[PDB]
């Protein structure tokens, strides 16, 4: 039952992610605006929670929390938990940033992004104003997001999309390729069915989404090269140890 | 409470491992195990007596047994306090580098100078037969015997072995470990318990605890050497398959 499968994935998503596209979108039409050093200082003063590195550290804190939620979410995808633990780890290593950057779009518009559970809005112009390595780490994610948003997915669509992202059978070093592939196919048949039901007039949505998954893999490939490089060129700036593990040999 | 902690680890071990040293030792001296000592008796054993080229076939039975023990060790680990709260990548590193040390320590439980119990005590495979297989294979098996017979002279029981194996898995110095200080903290808790347990359980055995600490370094070297031999069978013996989980375990090991 593809409808039942769809609904359980969706409820797994609602359970594990507090900020949904529904909540984000309703807010995006009250949050404290962060657009310079001063407003950031204020935001950190209780209102919401060098400049470029500090923003980078805030970014790391948010993505590592999203990795945690994705790890708990994956446990609810049928058959994920029955994979050997080393296969679960490989799947998370390689999929968690593709999922993060897909879900980023839910909290973005052309002008900036919601932070701290909707309490703040950080403007894209401020992020463009940061020093060179950091500024162009962030901008490509905005570019992907505004385009992604034009597909007009909802949270029920996104739940299946992220599930399908995590269960990629072609991740480097996967042990049981055929089992992962089989579970992914189940999610995708569900996703195709759900898009028919949810988006009846949206011709071509499902191949569009499959192409978005390849786009995300290249977004993340390019992201990793940039993070890998900051690790060398930017001697003073720290990387969270879990992120260090994720980018290690990626 | 070092005594409560010990009991909980003991029970996690009873739960996850069917063959205990207790059960093994009473078998090694209900009906006797079928003796496997040549091609013919192995064939009979697999004809439902015990299970339901000779050197490679034995090697494949070895793989099947150790991968089953890996599975039991992974479940066992979940019950060691604080193991499950480690990030999943750290749990995987701990099992990767610890499962075979734990395996070869528990091997001693089912071994005597003459051979080893197989299939839940249904079978006894002689050491002479295993010495008789082709060079690479005979050479992987024999050092485990040498380790086990020495290990058995310490006269540990299942309650001792449970904390020992826990301590093995929570080794803070495994290559590529993320949260080193936290793994070290959990191990120290296990070792304190173990030290307490040996003094209660083996009051006369002074120096047992340092002896055990040295056995863990002995096992690390046993396994380093095992991995080197397994990695080489992969290259030279191209016709003989390696279970995909063991291939993952030995991948980039040393
Ligand atoms: C103050 C900034 C608000 C944080 C917004 C969300 C944070 C990160 C979203 C992804 C941005 C891409 C580059 C930054 C991510 C670096 C850390 C990582 O690689 O996980
Ligand atoms: C037919 C013979 C059955 C023997 C089964 C006993 C199980 C283990 C004792 C031998 C362990 C050492 C052999 C090398 C292990 C190969 C697979 C592995 O490395 O996990
Ligand atoms: C689940 C039982 C424990 C299995 C232990 C096997 C661990 O293998 C390791 O898995 C990692 C991905 O998870 C890879 O990054 C390493 O290259 C690989 O060697
Ligand atoms: C906690 C879920 C997310 C974890 C992502 C971290 C995965 O890192 C990988 O973990 C393996 C050990 O498990 C190592 O072999 C690899 O070298 C490392 O790159």
Curated annotation (Swiss-Prot), chain A:
Sorted UniProt keywords: Activator, DNA-binding, Metal-binding, Nucleus, Receptor, Transcription, Transcription regulation, Ubl conjugation, Zinc, Zinc-finger
Intracellular or extracellular location(s): Nucleus
Domain annotation NR LBD: ranges: 32-249
Keyword Cytoplasm: no
Record carries keyword Transmembrane helix: no
GO molecular function annotations of the record: DNA binding; DNA-binding transcription factor activity; DNA-binding transcription factor activity, RNA polymerase II-specific; DNA-binding transcription repressor activity, RNA polymerase II-specific; linoleic acid binding; lipid binding; NF-kappaB binding; nuclear receptor activity
GO BP of this protein: adipose tissue development; apoptotic process; apoptotic signaling pathway; axon ensheathment; cell differentiation; cell population proliferation; cell-substrate adhesion; cellular response to hypoxia
PTM remark: 'Lys-48'-linked polyubiquitinated; leading to proteasomal degradation. Deubiquitinated and stabilized by OTUD3.
Leader sequence residues: none
Main location: nucleus
A GO cellular component entry from the record: nucleus
Tissues where this protein is expressed: Ubiquitous with maximal levels in placenta and skeletal muscle.
Top-rank taxon, per record: Eukaryota
Family as reported in the entry's similarity comment: Belongs to the nuclear hormone receptor family. NR1 subfamily.
Subunit-level organization: Heterodimer with the retinoid X receptor. Interacts (via domain NR LBD) with CRY1 and CRY2 in a ligand-dependent manner.
Chain's role: Ligand-activated transcription factor key mediator of energy metabolism in adipose tissues. Receptor that binds peroxisome proliferators such as hypolipidemic drugs and fatty acids. Has a preference for poly-unsaturated fatty acids, such as gamma-linoleic acid and eicosapentanoic acid. Once activated by a ligand, the receptor binds to promoter elements of target genes. Regulates the peroxisomal beta-oxidation pathway of fatty acids. Functions as transcription activator for the acyl-CoA oxidase gene. Decreases expression of NPC1L1 once activated by a ligand.
Name of the protein in its database record: Peroxisome proliferator-activated receptor delta
UniProt organism field: Homo sapiens
Gene: PPARD
Residues of the full protein shown: 174 to 440 of 441
């Amino acid at each position: 039952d593809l409808k039942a499968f769809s609904k359980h994935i969706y409820n797994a998503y609602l359970k594990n992610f507090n900020m949904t596209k529904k909540k984000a979108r309703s807010i995006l039409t009250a949050p404290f605006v962060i657009h310079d050093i001063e407003t950031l200082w204020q935001a950190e003063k209780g209102l919401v929670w060098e400049i470029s590195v500090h923003v980078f550290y805030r970014c790391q804190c948010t993505t590592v929390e999203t990795v945690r939620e994705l790890t708990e979410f994956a446990k609810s995808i049928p058959s994920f938990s029955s994979l050997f633990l080393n296969d679960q780890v490989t799947l998370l290593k390689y999929g968690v940033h593709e999922a993060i950057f897909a879900m980023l779009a839910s909290i973005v518009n052309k002008d900036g992004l919601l932070v701290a559970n909707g309490s703040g809005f950080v403007t894209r112009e401020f992020l463009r104003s940061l020093r060179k390595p950091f500024s162009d780490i962030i901008e490509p994610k905005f570019e992907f997001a505004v385009k992604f948003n034009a597909l007009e997915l909802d949270d029920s669509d996104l739940a299946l999309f992220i599930a399908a992202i995590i269960l990629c059978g072609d991740r480097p070093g996967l042990m049981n390729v055929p089992r992962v592939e089989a579970i992914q196919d189940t999610i995708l048949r569900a996703l195709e069915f759900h898009l028919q039901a949810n988006h009846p007039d949206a011709q071509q949505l499902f191949p569009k989404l499959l192409q978005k998954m390849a786009d995300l893999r290249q977004l993340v490939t390019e992201h990793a090269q940039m993070m890998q490089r900051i690790k060398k060129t930017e001697t003073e700036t720290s990387l969270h140890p879990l992120l260090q593990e994720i980018y290690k040999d990626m």
